[PDB]
Each structure stands twice: as structure tokens, then as C-alpha cells.
Amino acid sequence: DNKINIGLAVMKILESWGADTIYGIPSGTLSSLMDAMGEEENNVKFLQVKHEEVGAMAAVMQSKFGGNLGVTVGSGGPGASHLINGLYDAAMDNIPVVAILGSRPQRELNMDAFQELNQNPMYDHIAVYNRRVAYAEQLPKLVDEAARMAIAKRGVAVLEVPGDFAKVEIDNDQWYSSANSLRKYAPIAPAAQDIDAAVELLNNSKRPVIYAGIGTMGHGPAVQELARKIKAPVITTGKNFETFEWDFEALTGSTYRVGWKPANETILEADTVLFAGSNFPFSEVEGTFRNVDNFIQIDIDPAMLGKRHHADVAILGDAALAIDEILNKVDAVEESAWWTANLKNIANWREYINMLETKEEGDLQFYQVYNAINNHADEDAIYSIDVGNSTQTSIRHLHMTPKNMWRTSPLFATMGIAIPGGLGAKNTYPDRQVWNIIGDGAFSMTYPDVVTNVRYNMPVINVVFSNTEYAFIKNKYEDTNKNLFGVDFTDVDYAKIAEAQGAKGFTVSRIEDMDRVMAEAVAANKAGHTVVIDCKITQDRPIPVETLKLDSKLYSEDEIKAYKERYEAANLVPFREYLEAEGLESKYIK
Amino acid sequence: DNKINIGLAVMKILESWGADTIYGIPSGTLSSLMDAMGEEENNVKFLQVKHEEVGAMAAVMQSKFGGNLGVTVGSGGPGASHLINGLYDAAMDNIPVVAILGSRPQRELNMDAFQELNQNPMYDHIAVYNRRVAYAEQLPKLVDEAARMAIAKRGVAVLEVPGDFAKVEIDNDQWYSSANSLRKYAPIAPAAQDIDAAVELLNNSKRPVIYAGIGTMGHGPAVQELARKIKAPVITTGKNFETFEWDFEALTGSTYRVGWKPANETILEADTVLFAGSNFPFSEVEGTFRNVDNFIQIDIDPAMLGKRHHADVAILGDAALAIDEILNKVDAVEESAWWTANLKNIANWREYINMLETKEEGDLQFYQVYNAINNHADEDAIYSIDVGNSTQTSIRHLHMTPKNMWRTSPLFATMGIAIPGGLGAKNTYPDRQVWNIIGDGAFSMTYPDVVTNVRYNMPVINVVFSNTEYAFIKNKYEDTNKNLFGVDFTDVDYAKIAEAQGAKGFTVSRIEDMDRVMAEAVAANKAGHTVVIDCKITQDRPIPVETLKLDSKLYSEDEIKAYKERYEAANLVPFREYLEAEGLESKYIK
Amino acid sequence: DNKINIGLAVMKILESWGADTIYGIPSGTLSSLMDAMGEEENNVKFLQVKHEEVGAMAAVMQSKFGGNLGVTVGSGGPGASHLINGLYDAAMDNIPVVAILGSRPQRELNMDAFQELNQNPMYDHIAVYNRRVAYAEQLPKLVDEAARMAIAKRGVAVLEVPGDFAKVEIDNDQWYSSANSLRKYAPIAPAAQDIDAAVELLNNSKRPVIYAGIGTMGHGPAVQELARKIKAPVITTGKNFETFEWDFEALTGSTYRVGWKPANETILEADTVLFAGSNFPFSEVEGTFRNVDNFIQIDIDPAMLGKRHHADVAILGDAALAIDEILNKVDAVEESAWWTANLKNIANWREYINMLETKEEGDLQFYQVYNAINNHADEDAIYSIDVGNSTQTSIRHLHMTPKNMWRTSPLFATMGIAIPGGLGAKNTYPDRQVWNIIGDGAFSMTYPDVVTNVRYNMPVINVVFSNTEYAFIKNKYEDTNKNLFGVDFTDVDYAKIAEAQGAKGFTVSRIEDMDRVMAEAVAANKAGHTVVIDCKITQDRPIPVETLKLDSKLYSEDEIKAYKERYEAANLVPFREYLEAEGLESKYIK
Ligand SMILES: Cc1cc2nc3c(=O)[nH]c(=O)nc-3n(C[C@H](O)[C@H](O)[C@H](O)COP(=O)(O)OP(=O)(O)OC[C@H]3O[C@@H](n4cnc5c(N)ncnc54)[C@H](O)[C@@H]3O)c2cc1C
Numbered sequence A, B, C: 001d002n003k004i005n006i007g008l009a010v011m012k013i014l015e016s017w018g019a020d021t022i023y024g025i026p027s028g029t030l031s032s033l034m035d036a037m038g039e040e041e042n043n044v045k046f047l048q049v050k051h052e053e054v055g056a057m058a059a060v061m062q063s064k065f066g067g068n069l070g071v072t073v074g075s076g077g078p079g080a081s082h083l084i085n086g087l088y089d090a091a092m093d094n095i096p097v098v099a100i101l102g103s104r105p106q107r108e109l110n111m112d113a114f115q116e117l118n119q120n121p122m123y124d125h126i127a128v129y130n131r132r133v134a135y136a137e138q139l140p141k142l143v144d145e146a147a148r149m150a151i152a153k154r155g156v157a158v159l160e161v162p163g164d165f166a167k168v169e170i171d172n173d174q175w176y177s178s179a180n181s182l183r184k185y186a187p188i189a190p191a192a193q194d195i196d197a198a199v200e201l202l203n204n205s206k207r208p209v210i211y212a213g214i215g216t217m218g219h220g221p222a223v224q225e226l227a228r229k230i231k232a233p234v235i236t237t238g239k240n241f242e243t244f245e246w247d248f249e250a251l252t253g254s255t256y257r258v259g260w261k262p263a264n265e266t267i268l269e270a271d272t273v274l275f276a277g278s279n280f281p282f283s284e285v286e287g288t289f290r291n292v293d294n295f296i297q298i299d300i301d302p303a304m305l306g307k308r309h310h311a312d313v314a315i316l317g318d319a320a321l322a323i324d325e326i327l328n329k330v331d332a333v334e335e336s337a338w339w340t341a342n343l344k345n346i347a348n349w350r351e352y353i354n355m356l357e358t359k360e361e362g363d364l365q366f367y368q369v370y371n372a373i374n375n376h377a378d379e380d381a382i383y384s385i386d387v388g389n390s391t392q393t394s395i396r397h398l399h400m401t402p403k404n405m406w407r408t409s410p411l412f413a414t415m416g417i418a419i420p421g422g423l424g425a426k427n428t429y430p431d432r433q434v435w436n437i438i439g440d441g442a443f444s445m446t447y448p449d450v451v452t453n454v455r456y457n458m459p460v461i462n463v464v465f466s467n468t469e470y471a472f473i474k475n476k477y478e479d480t481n482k483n484l485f486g487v488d489f490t491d492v493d494y495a496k497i498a499e500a501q502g503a504k505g506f507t508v509s510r511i512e513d514m515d516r517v518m519a520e521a522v523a524a525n526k527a528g529h530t531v532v533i534d535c536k537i538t539q540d541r542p543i544p545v546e547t548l549k550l551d552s553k554l555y556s557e558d559e560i561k562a563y564k565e566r567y568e569a570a571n572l573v574p575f576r577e578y579l580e581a582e583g584l585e586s587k588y589i590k
């Protein structure tokens, strides 16, 4: 032992917690810390972005993709405030992340000096830890605690660090890392009494349905086995599609807008719901469970029990263990009209989606772009999805399995999350295929950072949907609005921009050219190039499954006619028809 | 009278306050308000940007450039948080602006619904008004008050508006605008007792100096007349250069880094300072006034009196009236060694700058880019300046007069302020030449919005300094840092990007090509095109005037030699030599 | 089913969560809610206090004493802000509590009306839930969630409720309680690998010590058995004395100021520390563990592992199970010089304390007041302790066992916590003896609420130490201050005030009268009277065990002489003497 630079102690602590990547932009108020990076064999690396928000989002998405604890830095003032969208996303998603806000040196604090201000209020509302380092010697301790807190509290830990502190020297025995003491609780078994109560309700239900959220991640096979055992269809959430085999016979999709027709119809006809590992945000406001008779919930967070609906049975514990216990105790069901009707309803929907995906010629639609992705993507591909309409609808098309990872900004829903997501993913899995699926609006908020993928040799495939409008937005106007006004724009050449950035650009606007273009894009990505595919698509909007104008007892002949014509849905059949075909009756229609 | 839509009443109120331009991006949580724009002959227009932060900054810069009250909108959640850098800039600069945060409809509040959250904490720390509208019927009243407050309190007024409120209808007599009652205080005359005290100190001073901040805006001729009357050199601030004729004989420039050599030397040799209309932030931390004997301050804000230094004389009132009263009462001074020495020191500095600006051939440096701007710019050109080193140094080169306007993000110093500044300026003065001077780092945070200038036919000239690094940052490292690490990057083709966006791009890397390129760029701008001049410059750093290694009694022969060699400053002469040449002695050197 | 008043639904929800007591003061902005209390057989009762802070503290202390979830209300504005000290105490102690802030009716919000303001910022920093109800119909849901959150997050849940909402009527099926779904994790078993690592270190230690915090509550017998098995002395925290039998042979007390001499000496001579269920706040700043060689920590909160000191062994899990596993695996130790030395050191300290407690005549000191309490208190008495010096020192005197409960405001340390503590305790255990031990300063901040105990027939015994000064404060001055100034005051007749309030008052100032007075006070309390014993004590300060001036190798003969004389500690013997008597040597002295 002897003496050590404070900045270096900080880097040693970060490395001990596995936080080997710092995202951000170099600046005077952060230079002392960054100067310590490297040296004494430290392996903490710096990934420089073009906009600090991309750095924050990348640090966060890194964890969402199963990577190490991310660290993002923002220079005093504007750099720090630029981290906001990334930090809010992490806070709402409960993702651990350490944010270091640089600051003018201690002597300048409170003097109303240049770019000097109190940054403590900035993130106090969303952070699990938010402190302004009071003196140099305690910086190591606070960085260590920030990492410990970010992880233990599953959130944003923020430290404001005067720029002169990291230069200070201390005795090597005046700092330590608590990373070695990191402990996490292993899956906890559920109460038998609660499992038994659930089993009884499921055994006696005439129309059971499993509604699985990410709490079931890693246990899709078990959930599918249970679905088959008791003949209960499966509904998933917009965040949990990868948990199931895309072609599972009883997968109805998700409910509400970013969902499928089957799930939306199933939930309104269901009797008993097994709500496993979910905190579905549309539950109350969209009346998702308005027709259900019994509600069983499984969750590891007591705060979630009975939150989205009254729970007749509450099971506290790991969804895996709970599903396993339920699967083992429930009675097998050989035949079920409810199940048969649902399987046909799902098949009908798949026929529709397949027809759209496999068109041979004409103006390119996003349906065929997704078709090309399915035909060229690796089986373990990673998908970083932005928040637009054309991108969220990817869950209706991508043929995923648990070998894939699909992540976005699902609750805060910040636009521009795709590119940073790709950075975090590629940083964690350098030899894995990474796709960033982005709408033009979201791309326009972050494309300058495409150069970051180029510069750091982290090749990704950017699929950009261009249609001179914010689809989702403009698409909703036609409903909640009796007008429209402003929502379109010129046609920027994204392929050319990509080339100017050192990336490879492609442009496609026809269905018959899509396969070849995707093939070339993928081959280029395998040659180590970051690619941008500018997909000039139509103004077509994904069919609104939250408002299915198909049942003749819910809508007029004219409405159904127009609905079918607009969405090329002539062959879609209302669920009630399939129910009646199996001898059942709708529980709410008529 | 009769009934009126709430959204329309809001637009009528905004129009009454002169807020005829709303900046932002359309979204579901803002559609009801936007739907009212237009109709019933309302003249409020919407300017759609690519990133909400540019919308916020543009709304703010609009006022900085003397335009109308700006309004910026951000969709619930991410759109709202994206406004942060623009709002913090306005708060610190005390610029009025109205920010409308969209929100999920009332019924969804507190339900933990999609993209639903409490946004009241977001800007509470910096806003002068920050309220969440409680019910539809009071929205008009609160928008009216927000405008009234933004203006009266010179700051950010924030309203969080549930998206269902603007759809509601009310009686026409249930709303009103207080814009008609808008009143502002006219310039207030200073206390004679304080003016007399100032005059006495100035009359008896052997080395007077006028330090003028933007409080003197509009009164540069008077300040120059006073300087000549009592033979007191003039020091200005980084925000106040346009107030003086660039070639005024006694203009020493500004102190500290973004300044000139003369001013930095003058302030350390001065006896009496007339601090007029300034809140210079480096005052205390850089010891700006450490050698002054007496300090006289003029300001209209009592909170500023005696803030930056003990004031021997404090004058509360308009700087114009105060300067006029002082000018009238002070004794004329015919000859002054102090004045003569300063004039020679200034001339010496101007010789140096002129030599750099007029080089004929070689690798392009930012000096020659500014030279070309001076040779082609209109006399009333508007300059929107970003915060980098190469851009802030523009005050050493631009030949401005009060006919020009030069604005930036001077205190919060957010990068990317230039492009939005150009939007706000061009929106206010459509027939006026507007220049956005940007460094590559700042450009990279905002270039996607170049398309906004194109789309709305608001032609501006973007001058981009590219050198694969953050100069300012990397430039300081060589001093405060004994290392460096990460601060460079690849070379993106900004001209090509501009073309892809519908703008005209130019690339220049040689001094001998600069004039022609600038000529073509300007002609293109006069043809209605937004232009981007990608200036590939050297790694040269502007000479550090905060650390002048020229006086042989302050630095070694080797240091001076190296300093002169690195900054091509062989001919720069330390101020002490000019003082001694006039029979004076340094008051602090030796 | 049918229709139900919203206020009543709220009361039904509170009752379902076990929150049957609301503390506060009636007001217009809370009347609609309170009007629902009772009726339809609801059993939620209202306990009216004189100052809202006492209501908040009582609601919080109710849970600290093992009672039901407390609810405290504060009228819009001043009533709400008056809750602050109680809420901050709960936040820092991680105690669940629901705080309802009344508010002017919805129509008045944002109108700058009378006593109308945005109260969301008020507690945002400390709350685990903080929302302003947006409309009447969701009030029930939010009250239900606030209770769920307060409990699950172990903290303060705050709701701002417009006064017109509770009057609204809704369908009975439009509300529900999630109380039925309340689930908590049962004690979790620790990792065998970590237990084994701990056992190895304990087996090989020459000077083991158990440092037990409240995490060990309910397992004192096991901790004592382990201490005896491996011959490891026990150190407790200021919050955990009741966990041990007061006369346990190896109890050394607590470290730092509110502690005993033995513990303070033991920790500095210890080699291996078993830090069980503690988050001792003085750890780092007082260098508590500066001389220890190995540190083993047991805690159920990952955020605490390695927080107060580097942990050589970290055990995540219930302290009970961990202590049981360690006890079972460790090797028994028959003899130990370390143990013998500690037992003698403890005995020496007990001789000193006993001598002070048993004086027969003279001016009353707090020592003899505690002696009288020990001689008249029930074996299961409850102690509500305030934060002054004379009250915190109660841990050196009270002869407690796990049958007792001792609670205070230990971390935030708000003065005046005693009386509200007594209210919460008596409300929970009506047939149990409750003592409020208060210093004059703290009593002076809350004595008007003595009438609350009288009014609600919740008889408690208030023991007040009066000495015309803030002891603790003035006591520290003589050290950290080279002066004093202001810290004393007149002599108010607290007994007379008590009588004026309907309570029974007693006054005592002599040791020979203490027993009889305490006897009469207790008998009066058993007659259903709230009592106030005004104990006029000396200016004597409890001996400073954080600075033991007894060892001749650490302090001068004169210092020791003066120290012994001032604190009547002639017979106290420095621990080093006992160590050397057993053949051991100090590891840090000399
Ligand atoms: C523009 C946009 C549109 C969208 N549209 C839709 C839509 O139409 N439909 C839709 O469904 N989604 C949609 N989403 C996504 C949606 O907003 C939600 O984020 C998502 O549905 C939440 O999914 P979840 O319940 O799986 O997980 P979360 O909300 O993350 O909740 C997961 C739950 O699992 C629990 N849990 C975690 N681990 C375990 C474990 N081991 N055992 C048990 N429980 C555990 C947690 O405590 C938590 O309660 C959209 C998103 C965007 C951005």
C-alpha cells in the first residue's frame, strides 16, 4: 500500500462492481476523473457519444440487455441535464444505473460563477440516491455506495462531483469497495396456501387465461406447458414477447393498441385470469379486466399485489417457482371448447399477418420489412426497438424465441432509445447481431450518434421507417381528434447521411426489392459495417386491435366494410363467431 | 358572444400577448391544443422541430433576439423532459418563455398508466410559475397568467396540461386576457447623491476604466463618449460586444478566457472601475478586480449591487440615464499617459489579430473563416453563436456594431444553442441575414434540425468548425490536466449531410479557397437556401489571454519563447512595456 | 351493492388495512373525509391532538411500538406543513405511515385563493408515495395504494386531497381494497457458504465481539447463548437495549456518547466483529471500528452490506436464522482471558452506576429518578424516550428485558417525540403501563398535548427532567466550544401546568423524597390519571464515555483527577488494567 489518486480509486471501485464502461462526453468538469481511466491496469473504458442523452440511455439499456452496471456522465449544467430522458427511463423501468454529474470546482460553488449551479434538485424526484460530494476524500466511498444503491434499489444513483476532487491523493487504506459483499435473494418459494387457492380457481374455471409479464422471463416453456395442461390461452405484455415461441399455438399476443386481435378479444371473454409477473399499465384506464370473474396474481413485489385489479388470490414469490407448483398441482384438461375457439381465432389472425408479410410486389409497407428481417436475422439476434407506431408493431411480426432479446423504453417511452440500446447491446455482446428498429421521428432525434457505432467498431443494423409523418401520433388523431394539423415533413436522405458518417446506407421503397436489400445490408454488417436501411414506406397504419370493427353486433355493416377495406382485413373473423362455432356464447356481446 | 372551445381561447390569449409562434412536436397529449391553432382567424403558428430541446431553445432565443414571447411544448414525459436545456438557459439568463407540458388525460393521472407521471417536480427549481392545470375550465386563465408571469418575472412559466382539457367548451364570457393591462417600468433616474459620488471618484482617479455589461445595451455611443471625455479605456463582457463599434480606439475587449489581451492587462492595472450593467460571473473566482482601488456600480437590480465586489458607490437605475448624468457632470480630461498606453496596447493586439485573419495561403484556421465572414456579412447581420472554444472566440474577430445582434447561451452554456437561435432569429426577422456559428461538437448535438430551417423556408448560414475534437475542452486539459485521453473523433462529411437534408453544403480546408467558398455560400443563402459550410480547420487553439506569458518579470525566457512560437505571437508586447514608455509603472508587477 | 359516499369507502379501505386510528385536528379542508368516520359500522376512530406534529409523530410511533398502520392528517397549508418532523422521523426510520394533506376544493386550485397552494413539493423528497388526487372517483384507489405503498416500501405515503372529493358518491363496485392481498416475506435463510466463512473467522479469533442492532430484535436469548458459547462480549446499539436482559454478564452496552464505558473500550480492543442487524450511524465519523481486524455483517438489506465498514464476510438473511446457524456450527470456548477481562470491566461499570442510583439523600440527580422508575415499573412497561441528554442516558439505567419496549426518534432525533410516542403506545396497549421520559426542552415543545392523554383517557406517566438548560447541548459546548452563551432559562412549574390540564402533577427535588413521589405518581396513574413528575435535578452531566480520561497512558494525572472528581468516577478502572490482569496487552494503547 501507499498513496493513490482519488480518480483511480473511483475507477478501481467501478471495476470491482463490474461497471467497466462509462458513457458520455469529455469536459473540463469531468477531466480529473477521466484522466484516471486506464493506468495501474484498470480496465474501465470510456465510450464517447455525440449527445449525453444517448450516453445515459446506452448505460441504462446495457443493463436491460443483461449487461453490467452502466455509468453515464454529464458535464456540469447542460451535460448533466442532457441525461434526463435516459435517467427517467431507468427510474420508471427500475433499472440500476450510476450517473455522475460533473461540476465546477469546490471553490466556485455558490459563487454564481460560469456554468456553476446547484444540480441537486435536478434528479431528486426520480433518484434512489442523489448526493453532492462534500469533499474529495469521500468521493470513493460515495461512488461505491452509489453502485451498491443503484443495484439494491433497482434505480438511478446520482453523484454531483466538483471537478477538483479527483485530483486529490489519499492513503490507499482510506478507501474500499463493498462489491465483494454484493448479495441478492435467490428465487423465493410461494406460500402453499396461496398456490392451492389458485389451483382450485383454475380447476373450476370454464375460461381460464394466463396473462404473463416479464416476471415470467426465463420460464416461457413452463408457462406454455401449463397453458397446454389446463387449456388456457396465453396473453403476453408488450415487454414479454421473447418469453414465448412466436409460433406457440395458444399465444394470443398482447392487449390494447400494441397488441394482437386475439388477445384483445380473449380478455373480454375470459372468466379467470392468472396475472403472472406483470404490472400492465393500461389495466384500469382501458378497462382490460372489466369482464373477468376471478383474478389470480403472482408477483415478487408486495407493492404490486392487487394493484391493477382486485386479487382473489395473491401469490408472493418467484413466478418460476409459482408456475411450477401450479403446473404440478392442477388437473389436466383434455378437451375445451374455449381452447379450441381461441386456437382458431389465433390462426385466423396469423393468416392475416402472413398475407401482409408475404406480398410480392408494390409499394413497400413495414409488414414486408419485418418479413425480410425474419428471413435474414440470426436466431439469437438482439432487437433494440424505438417507441413509434411502426416500430412497436414489431411484436406482431418478429418471429422471436427466448434466444432473442427485445427491449425498448416501454413506460416512459422516450423517443430515440433504439440507437443507444444498440450501443449498450453491442458493448455487452460484441459477436452478436444487433438490430435497431427506428421510425423517422425517433431517428431524427438520435441519428448523429450513428457515428458512435462506426467510431467504436460496434456494427449494428439500423432499420429506419420513413413516411414523412409521426404515424402513431397522426394515426390517433383520426380518432381522438376531429382534425389533424402539422404531423408531416420533408424527405431526408438517411442513406446519404449514413454514408457521410462512415456507415453503409441503403434505400428501398418497393416490396420486390426488399429481400435483396436486406441481404446486402446484413452481409455489409457482417463485414463490420454499421448500416442504415432507409425504408421508404407507405402511410398505412397498423390495424387498430383496440377497436375491432368486425362483429356485426358491435358495429354497423358500413363500419365493418370500411374497416376491412382500410386495413386489408376482409378475412378477419370476430371471435364471437369462433366461440359460437364451438357451442359457446359471448359473455358480454348482446 | 356564445360558446368557445378552450383550446381556441388559449390561442386567442397567446395571440393577445404577442406569442404567435409555438415551437415543438405534435403528439397525442398535445393534439387537442394544437387542433385549435388557426380557425376563427387566429394567427398563432406552429413551428415543428426535430428535437424538443431545439424547440425550447428557439422559443427562448426568439426573445433574446428581441422577438415576441416564445412558447414551447413538450409531450407528456419525454417531450417535456427534452425541454430542459432550453428552459435552464432561459432561467439563468432571465428570459421570459412559456412552456406547456402535455399530459395524459385527467382520468389517467395517478393511475400509473402509460407515459403518465407527475411532472410538477421536473422544473419546479427553475420556474417562476409551475402548475398542473386542475380542470379544463381554468386552462385559459392559467395560460394568460403564465404569459403575464413569464414576462413580469423574466423567466420560465410552466403549465402541465392534461390532454382532454382543450376539447372542452366554455361560455365566451368565462375567459379573458390580461395582455391589455401589460405595463413595464420606464427607465428610472438614478439618485443625484450617488451620481455625484461616482463623479468625484472618477475625477480623482489616475487610472479609470469602464467595465460595461449588457445593462448598457442601446447606449454604446454614450459610453464611448464618456470614455473619450475622461480618457478611460473600455472593457466589455462576452455578451456585450455589439454595443461598441468594433474599431473603437479604446475598446480593450473582455477579460478572462473568452476575451482579449488588452482588457485582461488593463483590469489588473486599473485604479477605479465603473462597473455598468454587468454581473460578470468570473469576478470572484478569477480575482478579476484584485488590484482595483475603488469600485462604482450601476444596475437596475438591487440584488446585484455590491455582488461581485465591494461597491464604494452604488447607483440604482438605468445605465443609460446614469451614463448620461455622469457624462454631463464629470471633468473633461485632455491628456492621459494611462489612456495613451492603453491605446497602444490595443493597437498591438489588433495588429496580431489582423495578421492572423489576413493570411493568404495554407491550412485553414478559424481566423480566416471569421475574416471571410467580415468581408461578406451584411452590416445588420444577426449572429447565433454556440458555446465551443472556436465559436466563442468570434468576439476577437467579428467586426460588429449596434446594428448587429450576437447571442449565445452565456451562463448555463448549453451546447447546440446556435441552430435554435437561428430559428428564433429568422422567425423574428425573415428578411435579415442570420449566421449560426457552430463547433463540430455542438453541431453534432443539433444538426438534424438543419432540416427545420429548410422545411420552413427560414434560410440561415451555418458555419461549422470541424477539427475532430472539442478544442476548448482538450485545450484546457493541457493546463488543468497532466494528461488528456478521449476528446477526438472521426471526420463526418457535414456538407453531404446538409445536402441530404435539402440544404446546400460546402467544404473548405484551405485559406486560399475561403473567400470564394464564403461568397458562394452567401449567394446560395440569398437564393433562399439554408447553407452549411464545413470548415475543416487546424488543431490550433486561440491564444490564452487569461495566462499571457509575455512579461519577462512574470515568466521565463523559455516560457515566453514557447508561448510566442505556439500562438504566432512574436509581436505581442506586454502591457507593462507600454505603461513604462509613457512614464508609468506597473502597480502589481514586481 | 348500490351507491356509497367516497369518504366512507376511504374509511372502509383504511379499516381493511388495520388503520383504525386517524390522528390530527378537524378543519374545513378535511371535514368531508372526517364526516364519514363512523356510520355503516365503520370502526375508524379520530384522535384529536393540539398540534399536528404530535399527530404525525403519534401515528408513526404507533407502528414503532408494534401497533397498526397509522394515519395522520394535516389541513391544507399550515396543518400539512406541521406534520414535517413526524414524517421526516418516519422516513429516516423506515416506518410506514399514511399522511393525508387536506386542500381547498378542486375549483380553487391554482387560483391563488385563500390558504390554497401546491403542496406536492412539500414532502416529495422523503416520501415513498406523493400524489395530489386528480378527481374524486379515484380517491379510494389512491388511499388503498398509499396504505399498500407505506407498508411495502416501509415509509411515508402522502396524498393531497381536495376538500370537495369525499362528498362525492360512487357505485359500490367502483372501489376495492387490496388489503386482502397483503403478503410479506418470511425470514429468509442465509447462504451456508457465508455462514461457514463467518464461523471460521469466529473460531480463529482471539478477541471476538458481537455488535447487535435491532435486526436481532426477538432473538436476544440466542445472541446471549452465542456470546456465552464462544465467549464473545456483546455490544448493542442505542435502539436495541431491550433485546438483552439488562443484567446479562457480558453486556458491555453501546458505543459513543449514548453508551457505556465497557462497550467503548471493548470495540477498540476487539479483533473480530460480528455486526448483526445494525446500521450504526457513528461508525465512520467516530472511527468506531478503526482497530478491528475482521468484520462480519448480517443483514436482510443488500444496501447495508459493507456500508459501515469493509465486510470480510457478508451474510444476507434474517439475523435470527443466521445467529442460529452460527451458534450451531461454531466451536464452544471454555475459557478466555478476553472474556474474563471484559466481564470484570462490565462489573466495574455496574458498580459505578449502582452507586449513583442508590444514593440516599441530597439534591436530586437523574440517576435516582431512574432508580425509582426501576423500583416501581411493571415488568412489561413501555418507554417512550425523548432525545435530550438526560433522557437518552436512560439506557445506562433502565433494567429492561424483551418484555419492555423502548422507542425514541433515534436518527432524525426530533425533540418532542416522547408525548406522541406515549399516545401511540397507549392507543395500541390500553392496559399497559406507559412512560414518557422527557427533558424540559423537549417537554416545552409538546406539553400542551398532555391534555390529549387526559381527554382520551389514555393515562401515561410523564417524567420531566428540569434543570434550566439543554444539558446535552450545553454539555457538548464545554468541549467543541471554547465558550457557551445562551442555553438556560427560567423555572416553569410543570406540575401546576399539568393540574391546569386535568392531569396530576408532582414536584420533587430531593433524593430522599424520590421513592415516595414515584410511588404516588404510579398509584395515581393506576387510578386512571395522566401524571407529570417535575423532577428538579442538578446541572450534573452524564459521564462522557466517548472520552474516558482514566488510562494513565492516554491522559495526564491532572486530567484523570479532574475527570474522576467531576463525574464521581474515582472507582472506574481503565479497561487496559483488566486486560493486563489477565495476561493480555492493549492492541492500540502505547
Ligand atoms: C408507444 C408504446 C405503446 C405500448 N403499447 C402497449 C400495448 O398496447 N399493450 C401492452 O401490453 N404493452 C404496451 N406497451 C408496453 C407497456 O407500456 C408496458 O411497459 C408493458 O406492458 C409492461 O409489461 P410487463 O407487465 O411485462 O412488465 P412490468 O411493467 O415491467 O412489470 C413486471 C412485473 O413483474 C414482477 N416480477 C419481476 N420479476 C419477477 C419474478 N421473478 N417473479 C414474479 N414477478 C416478478 C415485477 O415486480 C413487476 O410487477 C407499449 C409501450 C410503448 C412505448
Ligand SMILES: Cc1cc2nc3c(=O)[nH]c(=O)nc-3n(C[C@H](O)[C@H](O)[C@H](O)COP(=O)(O)OP(=O)(O)OC[C@H]3O[C@@H](n4cnc5c(N)ncnc54)[C@H](O)[C@@H]3O)c2cc1C
Binding pocket: A114, B212, B213, B214, B215, B216, B236, B237, B238, B239, B240, B254, B255, B256, B257, B258, B259, B276, B277, B278, B279, B280, B281, B298, B299, B300, B301, B304, B317, B318, B319, B320, B387, B388, B392, B408, B409, B410, B411, B413
Ligand atoms: C464557454 C463560454 C465562455 C465564456 N467566457 C467569457 C469570458 O472569458 N469573459 C467574459 O466576459 N464572458 C465570458 N462568457 C460570457 C459570461 O459567462 C457571461 O455570461 C457574461 O460575461 C455576462 O455579461 P454581462 O455582465 O454583460 O451581463 P449579465 O450577466 O446578463 O448581467 C447584466 C446586468 O445588467 C443589469 N441591467 C440590465 N438592464 C439594465 C439597465 N437598463 N440599466 C442598468 N443595469 C441593467 C442586470 O440587472 C444585470 O446585473 C463566456 C460564456 C461561455 C458560454
Ligand SMILES: Cc1cc2nc3c(=O)[nH]c(=O)nc-3n(C[C@H](O)[C@H](O)[C@H](O)COP(=O)(O)OP(=O)(O)OC[C@H]3O[C@@H](n4cnc5c(N)ncnc54)[C@H](O)[C@@H]3O)c2cc1C
Binding pocket: C212, C213, C214, C215, C216, C236, C237, C238, C239, C240, C254, C255, C256, C257, C258, C259, C276, C277, C278, C279, C280, C281, C298, C299, C300, C301, C304, C317, C318, C319, C320, C387, C388, C392, C408, C409, C410, C411, C413
Ligand atoms: C441524541 C441521540 C444520541 C444517540 N447516541 C447514540 C450513541 O452514542 N450510540 C448508539 O449506539 N446510538 C446512539 N443513538 C441511536 C443511534 O443514532 C442509532 O439510531 C442507532 O444506534 C441505530 O441502531 P441499530 O443499528 O440497531 O438499527 P438501525 O439503524 O435501525 O439499523 C437496523 C439494521 O438491521 C437490519 N435488519 C432489520 N431487520 C433485520 C432482520 N430480521 N435480520 C437482519 N437484519 C435486519 C436493517 O436492514 C438495518 O440495516 C442516539 C440517538 C439520539 C437521538
